[PDB]
């Protein structure tokens, strides 16, 4: 039972729902004062519940004698607060059990006394008539005894459920934001505090879908190399060293590398090098999100792995990488699909040629490939584009750029993107998780498995 169903069901009958256990204490204090959820049980001190109630209302709270809980419950003199401290409340809990459905939060079980307490409360003919709801922050993290008890109750015929919600205070805030007819003083007192770290749930996948350009990256971790230096280095010095040497490996400072050891010995002499070790970045998404150096390193690694064995050329423009089609290899059969996509009115379409009104500028089709760290996911971002051979003369073809793409509408752009995905990965987006690897013949290589199908979602409907 999803939390939305629990909220619709809990909100409808909050008058007779028991609770077993700072917005959460505050919302509960307001919820009690409001005469809803009359009886609340707890294990711990948390003497803050009664203090919050006194702040809300201005009167003391009954906190639990021989059978004081029994006397208060039987006489219907709500609201009642009783701490288990784990048979004095055991009879009262069983008496409470028939009267209204119970919801237990902040408890993982693990205590046999309360376990037998609840199991004994279940047996009677009408026990927890509204339902027993277990709300843990995560379903899979809960102790096995809780699931065993839920299954036992469901077998007995009771309507016990195990629902996954957030933290108890967040759950109570979400409950209270939809409780109706609350006095002004209570709302002024609680106001659900303030929500700084906004986190609104993503809906279900659901089922006119839209196809995005994002390719998922499921490689959760990669292995790479570290070099130790006897002297401090700056990133600019490393960058100019790579520019002047041009090794067959990818370098960054965080000093981190990926490629062959002899290239490292070429770029760095023995005197400055102390030792070479390995780095295991366990969480790639979090790492590239926290550090921009890792972001650039990983995007360049994926780029190198992507055009390693393919005839397409790799260029760079304002620090964004492009998969530009070379003129020499523009006649390959693999580009034929692209030849169809660029084509006008179902004919062959030129993908590399001479701009009609410039002396030496030569144009080609290309795709900008970027890395996007969204949430905790890595996406390969494909954007079709027209590349111009002189990097600094691109604007001279601006009109031509406007002329060619003027009619690359949704169908044409869809064809272009599908053809470019086929060119870059060799397979269509059906059951595709192809693997690429950069520098396969090196000690420190990186293999990345990229989902071939572009990210997409279907509109939710009935």
């Amino acid at each position: 039972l999803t939390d939305n169903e629990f909220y619709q069901h809990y909100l409808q009958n909050s008058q007779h729902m028991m609770w077993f256990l700072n917005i959460g204490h505050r919302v509960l204090a307001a919820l009690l004062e409001m005469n809803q959820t009359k009886v609340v049980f707890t294990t711990n001190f948390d003497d803050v519940i009664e203090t919050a109630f006194s702040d809300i209302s201005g009167k003391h709270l009954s906190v639990y004698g021989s059978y004081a809980a029994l006397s208060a419950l039987n006489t219907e003199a709500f609201p009642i607060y009783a701490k288990i401290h784990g048979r004095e409340i055991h009879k009262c809990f069983l008496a409470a059990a028939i009267r209204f459905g119970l919801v237990v939060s902040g408890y993982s079980g693990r205590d046999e006394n309360v376990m037998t307490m609840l199991r004994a409360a279940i047996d009677q003919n009408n026990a927890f008539p509204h339902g027993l709801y277990w709300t843990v922050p995560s379903i899979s993290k809960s102790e096995p005894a809780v699931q065993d008890l839920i299954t036992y109750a469901q077998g007995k015929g009771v309507r016990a459920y195990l629902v996954e919600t957030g933290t108890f205070d967040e759950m109570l805030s979400k409950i209270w934001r939809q409780v109706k007819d609350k006095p002004a003083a209570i709302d002024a007192k609680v106001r659900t505090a303030r929500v700084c770290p906004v986190s609104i749930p993503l809906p279900g996948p659901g089922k006119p879908a839209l196809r995005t350009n994002a390719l998922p990256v499921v490689t959760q971790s990669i292995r790479c190399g570290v070099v130790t230096l006897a002297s401090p280095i700056t990133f600019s010095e490393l960058k100019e060293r790579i520019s002047q040497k041009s090794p067959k490996a990818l370098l960054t400072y965080t000093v981190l590398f990926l490629g062959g050891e002899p290239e490292i010995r070429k770029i760095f002499s023995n005197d400055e090098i102390n030792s070479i070790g390995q780095y295991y970045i366990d969480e790639i998404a979090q790492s590239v999100a926290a550090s921009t150096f890792l972001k650039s390193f990983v995007e360049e690694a994926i780029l190198t792995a992507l055009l390693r064995e393919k005839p397409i050329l790799h260029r760079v423009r304002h620090r964004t990488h492009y998969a530009v089609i070379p003129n020499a290899s523009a006649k390959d059969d693999r580009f034929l699909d692209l030849r169809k996509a660029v084509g006008f009115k179902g004919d062959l379409g030129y993908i590399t040629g001479n701009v009609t009104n410039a002396k030496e500028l030569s144009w080609a089709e290309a795709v900008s490939i970027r890395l996007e760290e969204r949430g905790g996911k890595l996406w390969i971002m494909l954007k079709p584009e027209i590349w111009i051979k002189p990097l600094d003369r691109r604007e001279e073809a601006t009109d031509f750029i406007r002329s060619r793409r003027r009619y690359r509408f949704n169908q044409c752009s869809y064809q272009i993107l599908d053809a470019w995905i086929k060119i870059l990965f060799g397979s269509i987006g059906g059951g595709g998780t192809v693997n690429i690897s950069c520098f396969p013949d090196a000690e420190f290589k990186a293999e990345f498995e990229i989902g071939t199908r572009t990210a997409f979602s279907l509109g939710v409907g009935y």
Partner: protein, 59 residues
Amino acid sequence: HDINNHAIKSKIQSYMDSKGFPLQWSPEEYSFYFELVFRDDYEAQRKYLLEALASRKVS
């Protein structure tokens, strides 16, 4: 938001139409919204219909 406000009614109806639900006062809507809210739970549906049409608001 009070449901009999025009602005809130329009906003809620626009939201409902966003998820592809029936448009406006059309057949198979009342039952549709009941079966959507209560996801085939006839006991909870009965309890809500009792509460809405209860014998305390009737004059």
